[PDB]
Structure formats: C-alpha cells, structure tokens
C-alpha cells in the first residue's frame, strides 16, 4: 500500500553493506570518460550503451559481453587502476557519505562492510579521493567468482561479517545494503538484504519500479547510533527519505 511517512524512522541492524561508484563517490563521469576511451579504436563497441547498461558491472564483465576480446583479467586491472587519475580528480562525494564512513569507523569494524564491482586499485583511490579511510572490509571485482546482479558479493559480505541468511528468522540476521543501481539493488535482494536506494544514478521515479525497501536522496538523511553489544546491533536512522515501503521496518 501507501508508503510510510513519518520520520525519523528508527532500524535496529547487525551489518551495513555498501556501494561505491554512486553510493559513495559520484565516479560515474570518470567511468563514462573511460569507456569512451575504451571505445575509441572498436567500431563495433557502442560506448554510450555501455555506459548506461553497465552501472554496478564489473568492468572484466562489461568487456566480457561487449570487446570480448579484451576480457583478460590483468589487463581490466591495469586499465582501471588509472581511471581515478586519468579522469576522476574532480570526483565528489554523495553527500554525506563522508559523514558516514566516518561514523560506522566509530562502531567496531565488524558491523559494516564495502562491497564493490571496481578493482581494488580504482576503489581504494577512490577513497583516497575522498579523505575517507580505507574500509577494513573491503570486497572488489577480484575477490569474487560473480559479480553483481549475482548476489556473491553481498552473500561473501553478510558471511564474513558473521550475518549469514536465516532463512526461517530473518529479523536474527538483519542486513541492509546501500546501493544506486539496479544491477547492485538485484544483487542485494538475492543476498536476503534489505535496500537503501540512493537517488543519484538514477531518479526516485525509476528507482520506484526496483526492489529497494526506501529510497533517499543522499547519505544526509542517513545516520548510526551507538553499538549494542548484548545484541550485536546497530540502530539506523533515516532522518529524511524520498519513498519507504509499508514493510520496510519487517524482516
Ligand atoms: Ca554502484
Ligand atoms: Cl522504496
Ligand atoms: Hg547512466
Ligand atoms: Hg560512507
Ligand atoms: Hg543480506
Ligand atoms: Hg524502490
């Protein structure tokens, strides 16, 4: 029915698994710019198409369906790990994921984690960019057999910071993801996740039509309360949000 609309709205969470590219950092004209590069000596390769299908792609995936010929892992790495140099500088936040990082640094390193299709040496810049810390847990493109929409990297996420599915009892294993792509948002749900939309990539009226359980406009809506040991949780808070399911508060 109708969404919620009182706020705050107050979650209590065990893990916090999150994006990059769109969620924290806003790299996506980095991304294109590099993809029109990549395009530039192959005719039949369609940049733009790419640009806006692949949003939470692996790039070994992207080139995989696109210049197959190029899908050789070593060679992926290389080519993105110049991507924040190159072209990604003037890259900004979403803003208030600083804000955030540093909040969920200030809870113990267990309840969060980050979960992304770039590679370590373009995610890790990426960061850098931003003078936010490294996360201590840290997924990319390599450590993972499949990528995003396949759930692997939420599930290896959820896994390892000791919050597997509890299929029959979902709400003792409470995991939200924080996500701006359908690709990311699919991937998330299949991992049993419940999904924070960010409006950025993509606009509330699109993001309306995907599986995310609320839907803010950036991470200034967002913020963490304080550590319960005895339940090994977290309380979320929304401030502010653009659209919330009627069950988002259920697991
Ligand atoms: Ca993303
Ligand atoms: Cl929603
Ligand atoms: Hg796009
Ligand atoms: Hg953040
Ligand atoms: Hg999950
Ligand atoms: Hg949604």
Known sequence: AMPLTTKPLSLKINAALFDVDGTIIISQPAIAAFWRDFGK???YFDAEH???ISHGWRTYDAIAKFAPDFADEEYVNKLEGE???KYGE????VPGAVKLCNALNALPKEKWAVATSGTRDMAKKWFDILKIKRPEYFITANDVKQGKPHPEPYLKGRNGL?????EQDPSKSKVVVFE????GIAAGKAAGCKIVGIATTFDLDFLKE????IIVKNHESI?????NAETDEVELIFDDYLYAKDDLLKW
């Open 41 to 43: 000596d192959k005719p």
């Open 162 to 166: 000791g919050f597997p599915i509890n």
């Open 210 to 213: 995907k599986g995310c359980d």
């Open 223 to 227: 913020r963490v309360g304080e550590y």
């Open 50 to 52: 790419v640009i806006h």
């Open 90 to 93: 003037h890259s900004i936040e």
């Open 83 to 85: 991507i924040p140099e």
């Open 180 to 183: 701006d792509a359908p690709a």
